[PDB]
């Protein structure tokens, strides 16, 4: 690549893999989104929360491919593994599943950051600082907040709490 | 009729009958509407949901008579049978009664569609596709959603749930 | 009924019956409306006159049910008898049929008024004065005017007169 | 009185007495209003409902005195009896107390109406029809609705229901 | 054709033929239009009715050729047969001639629809449903209405009726 400068094939492969992790998450959020939209689930606020997250993840993916091309790296796409469940249970279960997903998305970003530090790729680290690290952190505290709120409303009347959470916070 | 073309007396009679089914539904929705408006029921959101549906049904009826005249068919009106209950019970019971009504309204439309296919009346089918099939489908998923939400809020505290459903979703 | 005050079961039953008379009239005006819309009748001004009256009648009906609920009375709906003709003849015949209908609607209102006076229900009478008595009176003089005009234009050339009446007054 | 015409001293005295009944109700609604405003009651929606009713009642009073002067009658004011309770209990109790008050205000109006009919005072009856009969009827159905809603939310969790009613309907 | 998919040479030839039927109708409506514009006919409302229909028909033709190209079919144009009369008689005769034309245009569309059904060309049928079936139906009821109106005004004074129809409905 005539424009490739200080872009180790190590960081190239790691950004291809987190590109896949990000499209995989966007795929899972789509499954969650359409399950809270099921006639027998009917939590339109929860479906709307996961549909927005499926798009935020696709966009992280495109941002990472755009950056891969900018550094002269080559996008290599892998098969997208299907969501890991077909039905998500209640909003609590769905909320817990999503924050596992974001924390593993976040640990993948932290790993790429450390990889950019070993290889001394200031542009790569400055990239993950601006557009991914802060976003994941805000998203996970946001989901931890929702989880704490759903857990407090779920103690006694679950149906009522799930309805109230969907109606009052989402 | 000087303008009647490919309009079988079979589809004529079937559209007169679904015209009646549609005015009958509009009549039932009026009864439901005024029952949630009773001083001892007082669920103004539920009364407002059924008053709007009584008008959506009257308008399907007029749309069908307008189309009957456009094809040169002759409107023949029958006595409108009275709603099948005087008091509707709770919002759950009323919601379940309405979706029976919409599904039988929808099966009547599907029957007319099949009748338009046997007789090869592309204009009649294109008509029921545009203005009735999609509308019934959206309406029934909308009512299935409400039912799932009322059933989840009704498990423990029914009074509270009925109040919350009426206040938060309608 | 915890809010029912000075609302005799006599006036309750009489308002349920005039509610039916009003939905019945709205049904008849719908039949008249769709008959002047027939391809072989084609008097769009006459169809438009009777479609507007079918809605004015439905609204009297809803006004009466709204008032029945306000006084703590219970709406009881009866089967709606079908219009009393399928084809209405000429605009003259249709106009004469409508004013019979309005005058019997008006005599039903006058009867309910007398019933509200025997039982001393100032709220019921004040109600029929504001929203029905004046409306019927204006409507019947309006129809008597149309009848006098159609009869004057119908003497010699009927086709021409019917066309002119529909074109110039409706 | 040089302008007094067909204004029986019977209707004069009865309008002076309903003027007192109306200032008395306005006084009671003020007491209810300030009790839901107490730091240990704190239901600002209920306090706001009764403060608005205390003013609607004062204005009925002024309307009646204005009409008494218009007919040449003489306002005679009596001592205003104090509200009949100092603390109103819960919103349910307060709501039940208010609708007793409105129904006795309404029966006082109906009595004055009958009195205006015996003495044949068309102006007096036309007056109570326009500004009091309809208002009381709408107000009592409004309070019957609130009572039905508070009673449904009060079955199990009372604190929660009282909070929800005040937050969602008032 | 590299883009031709499921487009039978049967439907190709049938759309070329209805393209011709549509340009032929547009040609006939042009002849009718210029005949009501003749100094010795002078019915500018009737000339304006047929000039607008000559353009609506040309546009159906272009819509059909545009669709033929979209499916990869090949437009094949045939000689346009001249209108079938040079003088159209009265507005009644001209109106009757036009509705024969529209009904045969409509039966040609219904035939193409059946042809699209045998060959299972959902795109072709969905095409004729959206842009031709509904249009022809509305147009023929519109012409049946005009015919009923002209026939009613033509009974006695024909000159007067023809003038009035042209002045009041067109």
Swiss-Prot record, chains A, B, C, D, E:
Superkingdom per UniProt: Eukaryota
Binding annotation for Fe cation: 52, 55-56, 59, 62
Compartments reported by the entry: Cytoplasmic vesicle, Autophagosome; Cytoplasm; Autolysosome
PROSITE patterns for this protein: FERRITIN_1 (PS00540), FERRITIN_2 (PS00204), FERRITIN_LIKE (PS50905)
Entry keyword set: Acetylation, Cytoplasm, Cytoplasmic vesicle, Iron, Iron storage, Lysosome, Metal-binding
Any Pfam family matching the protein: Ferritin
Domain annotation Ferritin-like diiron: ranges: 5-154
Location of the region described as Catalytic site for iron oxidation in the Swiss-Prot/TrEMBL record: 52-59
SUPFAM superfamilies, per database record: Ferritin-like
GO biological process assignments: intracellular iron ion homeostasis; iron ion transport
One Gene Ontology MF term: ferric iron binding
GO cellular component labels: autolysosome; autophagosome; cytoplasm; cytoplasmic vesicle; ferritin complex
Residue ranges the record marks as coiled coil: none
Keyword Metal-binding belongs to the record: yes
Keyword Transcription in annotation: no
CDD domains membership: Ferritin
InterPro entries for the chain: Ferritin, Ferritin-like, Ferritin-like_diiron, Ferritin-like_SF, Ferritin_CS, Ferritin_DPS_dom
Further comment: In horse spleen the light chain is the major chain.
General function of this protein: Stores iron in a soluble, non-toxic, readily available form. Important for iron homeostasis. Iron is taken up in the ferrous form and deposited as ferric hydroxides after oxidation. Also plays a role in delivery of iron to cells. Mediates iron uptake in capsule cells of the developing kidney. Delivery to lysosomes by the cargo receptor NCOA4 for autophagic degradation and release or iron.
Subunit relationships: Oligomer of 24 subunits. There are two types of subunits: L (light) chain and H (heavy) chain. The major chain can be light or heavy, depending on the species and tissue type. The functional molecule forms a roughly spherical shell with a diameter of 12 nm and contains a central cavity into which the insoluble mineral iron core is deposited. Interacts with NCOA4.
Family listed: Belongs to the ferritin family.
Protein name: Ferritin light chain
Source organism of this protein record: Equus caballus (Horse)
Gene that this polypeptide is encoded by: FTL
């Amino acid at each position: 690549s005539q424009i490739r400068q200080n872009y180790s094939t190590e960081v190239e492969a790691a950004v291809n893999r987190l590109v896949n992790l990000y499209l995989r998450a966007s795929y899972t959020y789509l499954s969650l989104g359409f399950y809270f939209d099921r006639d027998d689930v009917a939590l339109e606020g929860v479906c709307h929360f996961f549909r927005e997250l499926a798009e935020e993840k696709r966009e992280g993916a495109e941002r990472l491919l755009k950056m891969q091309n900018q550094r002269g790296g080559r996008a290599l796409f892998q098969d997208l593994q299907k969501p890991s469940q077909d039905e998500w249970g209640t909003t609590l279960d769905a909320m817990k599943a999503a924050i596992v997903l974001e924390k593993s998305l976040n640990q993948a970003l932290l790993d790429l950051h450390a990889l950019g530090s070993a290889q001394a790729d200031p542009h790569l680290c400055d990239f993950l600082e601006s557009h991914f690290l802060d976003e994941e952190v805000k998203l996970i505290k946001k989901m931890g907040d929702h989880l704490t709120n759903i857990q407090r409303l779920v103690g006694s009347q679950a149906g009522l709490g799930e309805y109230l959470f969907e109606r009052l916070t989402l």
